[PDB]
Amino acid sequence: AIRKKLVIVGDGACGKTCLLIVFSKDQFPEVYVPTVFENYVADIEVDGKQVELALWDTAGQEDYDRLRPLSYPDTDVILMCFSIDSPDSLENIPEKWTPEVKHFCPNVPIILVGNKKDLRNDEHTRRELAKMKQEPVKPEEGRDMANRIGAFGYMECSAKTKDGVREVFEMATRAALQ
Amino acid sequence: SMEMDEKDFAADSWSLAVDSSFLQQHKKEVMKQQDVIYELIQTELHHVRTLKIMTRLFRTGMLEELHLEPGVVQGLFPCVDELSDIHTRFLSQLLERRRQALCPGSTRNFVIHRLGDLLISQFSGPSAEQMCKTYSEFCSRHSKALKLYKELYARDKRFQQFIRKVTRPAVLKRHGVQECILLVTQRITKYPLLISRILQHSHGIEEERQDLTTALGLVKELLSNVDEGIYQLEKGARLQEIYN
Numbered sequence: 025a026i027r028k029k030l031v032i033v034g035d036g037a038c039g040k041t042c043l044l045i046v047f048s049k050d051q052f053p054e055v056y057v058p059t060v061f062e063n064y065v066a067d068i069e070v071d072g073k074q075v076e077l078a079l080w081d082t083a084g085q086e087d088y089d090r091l092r093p094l095s096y097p098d099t100d101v102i103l104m105c106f107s108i109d110s111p112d113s114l115e116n117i118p119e120k121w122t123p124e125v126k127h128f129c130p131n132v133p134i135i136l137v138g139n140k141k142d143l144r145n146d147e148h149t150r151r152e153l154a155k156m157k158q159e160p161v162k163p164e165e166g167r168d169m170a171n172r173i174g175a176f177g178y179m180e181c182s183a184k185t186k187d188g189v190r191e192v193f194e195m196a197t198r199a200a201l202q
Numbered sequence: 203s204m205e206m207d208e209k210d211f212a213a214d215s216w217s218l219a220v221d222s223s224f225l226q227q228h229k230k231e232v233m234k235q236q237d238v239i240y241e242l243i244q245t246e247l248h249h250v251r252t253l254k255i256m257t258r259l260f261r262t263g264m265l266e267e268l269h270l271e272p273g274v275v276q277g278l279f280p281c282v283d284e285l286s287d288i289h290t291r292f293l294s295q296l297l298e299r300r301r302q303a304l305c306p307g308s309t310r311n312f313v314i315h316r317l318g319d320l321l322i323s324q325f326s327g328p329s330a331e332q333m334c335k336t337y338s339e340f341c342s343r344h345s346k347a348l349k350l351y352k353e354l355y356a357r358d359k360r361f362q363q364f365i366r367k368v369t370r371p372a373v374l375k376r377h378g379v380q381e382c383i384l385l386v387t388q389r390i391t392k393y394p395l396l397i398s399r400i401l402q403h404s405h406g407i408e409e410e411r412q413d414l415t416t417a418l419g420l421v422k423e424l425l426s427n428v429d430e431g432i433y434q435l436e437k438g439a440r441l442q443e444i445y446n
């Protein structure tokens with residue numbers, strides 16, 4: 025098995041910690057959802073290739089511009105996250121997160137991931153967003169942002185239902201191998 | 203870690219660690235508060251364990267088995283003895299607070315009602331000054347440590363066999379040299395996330411809500427000072443590159 029490193033970035037509450045917890049845990053957290061994620065080394069076999077994929081979170085480092093970049097050395101793949109219930113988290117992608125990752129991780133593939141896809145058809149979410157002249161992020165808005173920032177690809181998932189989660193990490197492993 | 207503490211923190215939550223007949227006697231709000239306090243202590247126990255892997259397995263093993271040039275081991279593991287002293291003392295205080303809270307006749311059933319004062323003490327005065335100075339030094343030496351590791355692994359056969367040997371056990375899967383360094387750098391930014399969530403479930407006693415609010419502010423002030431005190435050292439960096 026070859027060792028690869030994955031780092032997830034995105035605004036606080038984009039759901040990055042939850043996504044790492046759900047992927048790494050053997051059984052879904054039905055009793056307690058952890059506040060933080062330390063690290064994990066996943067054994068993944070994708071397209072016949074075995075990889076040890078080390079997983080890291082940047083949660084807690086969003087306000088600290090000199091500590092945060094210490095998470096980037098030797099990263100092989102970046103997951104750049106936004107929440108579908110937060111059009112504001114998508115707006116911070118191109119001019120905040122993207123120039124930072126391109127500077128510290130040149131030539132590293134970025135996969136733009138729309139988290140919390142289950143909230144796109146949630147009535148409470150649609151009502152709260154409608155009060156600020158907003159609506160959940162549309163699939164074409166996510167794809168266009170991924171195209172604009174030079175992302176390797178665009179994917180969506182739901183940590184709550186697990187839908188799309190395995191596919192994101194298998195594709196991240198293929199991106200890291202390229 | 204020692205077996206007694208590993209077993210006390212083996213469960214995925216406080217609600218699964220205590221006896222079910224004890225859990226049943228508490229309101230949901232108390233359970234939510236105790237689950238987050240349990241996660242703070244459990245992750246602090248794991249953080250001290252990461253520091254012991256660095257000091258005892260890697261650092262001391264390199265000194266006792268390898269013929270590395272003087273000053274090379276210090277460059278790979280900057281400040282590890284100081285970091286171990288800070289966190290082992292903090293962990294001792296957290297575990298003593300839990301131990302005093304146990305019911306007579308039990309080694310698992312407890313409720314911690316007064317964490318705020320312990321957090322204010324840790325993140326104020328001389329202990330906060332020591333944490334600030336030590337993380338400013340550690341985090342400024344982080345990139346240099348990773349580069350020195352990569353150089354030694356690629357060029358030194360005995361170093362490569364030593365690393366492959368001591369990191370072979372499954373229990374070391376997440377704890378190679380570079381992984382330990384980033385786990386330590388990331389530890390300090392976990393504290394506000396944990397304290398904020400404990401505070402969210404600590405409104406029942408106003409003195410506790412105020413103490414956790416003061417603690418959260420102290421931790422953020424410490425992090426701001428550490429972040430402002432970092433400048434990455436680079437081996438062989440010239441003075442001209444530094445002053446420009």
Ligand SMILES: Fc1ccc(-c2ccn[nH]2)nc1
Pocket residue numbers: 089090093123124127
């Ligand atoms: F283009 C960029 C964007 C961000 C940064 C940066 C973020 C934190 N430290 N440095 N550097 C260059």
Ligand SMILES: Fc1ccc(-c2ccn[nH]2)nc1
Pocket residue numbers: 254258
């Ligand atoms: F967890 C520990 C702590 C200290 C030591 C130690 C200090 C000197 N010799 N051995 N070993 C293991």
Ligand SMILES: Fc1ccc(-c2ccn[nH]2)nc1
Pocket residue numbers: 057058059394395396398399402
């Ligand atoms: F599931 C949760 C709920 C709250 C939090 C939280 C609140 C403040 N910091 N972290 N984290 C995870």
